A paper describes a structure:
The most central node within this network is the RNA-binding protein G3BP1 and its paralog G3BP2. G3BP1 and G3BP2 each exists as a dimer, with each monomer comprising a folded dimerization domain (NTF2L), a folded RNA recognition motif (RRM), and three intrinsically disordered regions (IDRs). Dimerization via the NTF2L domain is necessary for stress granule assembly, and experimental disruption of G3BP1 dimerization results in rapid disassembly of fully formed stress granules. The NTF2L domain also harbors the binding site for other stress granule proteins, including the RNA-binding proteins caprin 1 and USP10, which respectively promote or limit stress granule assembly.
Residue numbers in the entry:
A (entry chain C): 4 to 42, 51 to 138
B (entry chain A): 3 to 43, 52 to 100, 103 to 138
The structure:
C-alpha cells in the first residue's frame, strides 16, 4: 500500500528541477513550516524564509544534470534522497553538487509529501 | 532545552562513525537496528547482521577519512538528517558523499540509532 521510495525520489527530483527552471517562486510551496533549506553558509527555515532565500538567488534559465539519485524509506513513512549532479544558473558554468532531501507525509491528503529538508552543496565550495 | 542540538548530534555522530571505521569496523553494526538500510558503492541490505556482513565485505583496513564539511538538521519525529562531504582513502583520498538519517531510539532521548546510511564516491557518479 506503499509507493516505491526509489521511484518517489526520482519523480520528486524531476518535479524539483523542472520547477526550479520554470517558476522558482512557488518553489517554497513544496516546503512546510519546519523545513530546512541550503544551497559554510547556514541553512534557513520554514516557508516565508525559504521562499525569501530562493528569491535572493536569482534562479534563471536554470539547467541541471542529474548524474545520480538514491532514495530509501526512513522513520515514519518518510523518504530520504541522495542526489549528485551539475547545476547551472544564468546559463553560466555547470558546477558539481551534492544534495540531500527528506520527504515526509504532508498528512492532510494521503500519499502527498512535503520537503522537510533540502540540503545542497557545491563540491567546488567545499572541496 | 527539550531536545539535543541537531548539528551537535550530527558532528559527534560523524566523529564516532568514521573513527570506529578506522578503529574496528566489526563494531559498526552496533550503530544500526533491524529497520536500518546500508547502501555503499547498490540496493540496501537491512539489519545489524547483513549490514555487518556488508560492512565486512568491504575489508575496511586502516580506513582514513577527511571530513571537509557537515550538515546536520532536524527532520520529522526528532530525527537528525546528516549529509557528509569528504575524501576517503582506504591509498588516495577519494571525494565522497554520505547521507545519514538518525532516528530517536525511543526509550530515552539523547540516544539514537542509524535508520539510514547511503554512501557514494563521486568519481563513480559523473
Ligand atoms: C494540494 O496541496 C496544496 C498545496 C500544494 N503543495 C503541496 O502539496 C506540496 C507540499 N507538495 C508537493 O508539491 C509534492 N507533490 C505531491 O505530493 C503530489 N503527489 C503526487 O503526485 C503523489 F501522489 C505521487 C508521487 C509523485 C509520490 C508518485 C501532489 C500532486 C501535489 O499531490 C512534491 C514536492 C512531490 C512529492 C513527491 C514526489 C514528487 C513531488 C501546492 O501549492 N502545489 C502542488 C503547487
Ligand atoms: C548491548 O549493547 C547495547 C547497544 C548499544 N547500541 C546503541 O546504543 C545504538 C542503537 N546507538 C548508538 O550507538 C548511537 N549512540 C548514542 O546514541 C549514544 N549517545 C551519545 O553518545 C550522544 F547522542 C550524546 C549526545 C550527542 C546526544 C549529547 C548513547 C550514549 C549510546 O545513547 C550512535 C549511532 C549515535 C547516534 C547519534 C549521535 C551520536 C551517536 C551499544 O552497543 N553501544 C552504545 C556501544 C557502541 C559501541 C560502538 C559503536 C556503537 C555502539
Amino acid at each position: 500500500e506503499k509507493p516505491s521510495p526509489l521511484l518517489v525520489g526520482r519523480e520528486f527530483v524531476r518535479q524539483y528541477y523542472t520547477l526550479l527552471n520554470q517558476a522558482p517562486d512557488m518553489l517554497h510551496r513544496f516546503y512546510g513550516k519546519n523545513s530546512s533549506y541550503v544551497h559554510p553558509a547556514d541553512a534557513v527555515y520554514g516557508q516565508k524564509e525559504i521562499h525569501r532565500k530562493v528569491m535572493s538567488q536569482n534562479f534563471t534559465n536554470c539547467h541541471t544534470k542529474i548524474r545520480h539519485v538514491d532514495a530509501h524509506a526512513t522513520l515514519n513513512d518518510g523518504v530520504v534522497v541522495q542526489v549528485m549532479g551539475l547545476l547551472s544558473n544564468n546559463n553560466q558554468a555547470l558546477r558539481r553538487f551534492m544534495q540531500t532531501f527528506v520527504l515526509a507525509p504532508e498528512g492532510s491528503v494521503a500519499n502527498k509529501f512535503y520537503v522537510h529538508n533540502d540540503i545542497f552543496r557545491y563540491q567546488d565550495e567545499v572541496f
